[PDB]
Amino acid sequence: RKPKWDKNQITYRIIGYTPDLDPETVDDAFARAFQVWSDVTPLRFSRIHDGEADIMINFGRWEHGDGYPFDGKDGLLAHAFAPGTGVGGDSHFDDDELWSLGKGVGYSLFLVAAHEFGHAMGLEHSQDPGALMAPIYTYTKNFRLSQDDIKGIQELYGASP
Ligand SMILES: [Ca+2]
Ligand SMILES: [Ca+2]
Ligand SMILES: [Ca+2]
Ligand SMILES: [Zn+2]
Ligand SMILES: [Zn+2]
């Protein structure tokens, strides 16, 4: 009934950056976001620096060339497409927002990314208020995956070796 990736080897590339954080910190917040899923499944993520990747990462504001617009400060935060060719799997983040690692003021890039990557793997929203896949953003200092999230991703790719 649902679409998923054919093999467990997926590539990704950060083709656009934001002015709000150091490039090395951005690369780290994105890798940490992928690991939350690879720790409970057989999935493997490899970063490439040339050519097109399975999951293209980017930033944008308002219409950015895909029919699905953003909306300035606050409101929508980001979005991702289901497993598919071409644009499928791509994750876009709104740059009218202030990205940080939570706290002071802004939205945690690590938290929003972990959520969008669940989409790129084939997950939908969850009715569980405490789930990472819930539709609303909530900041928490000590993050941990809920049973609901673990149960859904393992249903699609199996459990961790
Ligand atoms: Ca917005
Ligand atoms: Ca893609
Ligand atoms: Ca910004
Ligand atoms: Zn987009
Ligand atoms: Zn979502």
From Swiss-Prot:
List of residues binding Zn(2+) 1: H115, H119, H125
Binding site for Ca(2+) 3: D71, G72, D94, E97
Induction comment from the UniProt entry of this chain: Aspirin appears to inhibit expression.
Tissue and organ expression note: Produced by normal skin fibroblasts. PEX is expressed in a number of tumors including gliomas, breast and prostate.
GO biological process, one term: proteolysis
UniProt: Ca(2+) 1 binding residues: D20, D95, E97
Residues covered by region (Collagenase-like 2): 109-161
Stretch list, region Collagenase-like 1: 1-99
Binding site for Zn(2+) 2: H64, D66, H79, H92
MF annotations from Gene Ontology: endopeptidase activity; fibronectin binding; metalloendopeptidase activity; metallopeptidase activity; serine-type endopeptidase activity; zinc ion binding
Residues that hold Ca(2+) 2 according to the record: D54, G86, G88, D90
Modification after translation, per record: Phosphorylation on multiple sites modulates enzymatic activity. Phosphorylated by PKC in vitro. The propeptide is processed by MMP14 (MT-MMP1) and MMP16 (MT-MMP3). Autocatalytic cleavage in the C-terminal produces the anti-angiogenic peptide, PEX. This processing appears to be facilitated by binding integrinv/beta3.
This protein's UniProt keywords: Angiogenesis, Autocatalytic cleavage, Calcium, Collagen degradation, Cytoplasm, Disease variant, Disulfide bond, Extracellular matrix, Glycoprotein, Hydrolase, Membrane, Metal-binding, Metalloprotease, Mitochondrion, Nucleus, Phosphoprotein, Protease, Repeat, Secreted, Signal, Zinc, Zymogen
Gene Ontology cellular-component terms listed: collagen-containing extracellular matrix; extracellular region; extracellular space; mitochondrion; nucleus; plasma membrane; sarcomere
Superkingdom to which the source organism belongs: Eukaryota
Active site: E116
Subunit organization: Interacts (via the C-terminal hemopexin-like domains-containing region) with the integrin alpha-V/beta-3; the interaction promotes vascular invasion in angiogenic vessels and melamoma cells. Interacts (via the C-terminal PEX domain) with TIMP2 (via the C-terminal); the interaction inhibits the degradation activity. Interacts with GSK3B.
Notes on the domains: The conserved cysteine present in the cysteine-switch motif binds the catalytic zinc ion, thus inhibiting the enzyme. The dissociation of the cysteine from the zinc ion upon the activation-peptide release activates the enzyme.
Family: Belongs to the peptidase M10A family.
Disease as annotated in the protein's UniProt record: Multicentric osteolysis, nodulosis, and arthropathy: An autosomal recessive syndrome characterized by severe multicentric osteolysis with predominant involvement of the hands and feet. Additional features include coarse face, corneal opacities, patches of thickened, hyperpigmented skin, hypertrichosis and gum hypertrophy.
Functional note: Ubiquitinous metalloproteinase that is involved in diverse functions such as remodeling of the vasculature, angiogenesis, tissue repair, tumor invasion, inflammation, and atherosclerotic plaque rupture. As well as degrading extracellular matrix proteins, can also act on several nonmatrix proteins such as big endothelial 1 and beta-type CGRP promoting vasoconstriction. Also cleaves KISS at a Gly-|-Leu bond. Appears to have a role in myocardial cell death pathways. Contributes to myocardial oxidative stress by regulating the activity of GSK3beta. Cleaves GSK3beta in vitro.
Protein name, as recorded: 72 kDa type IV collagenase
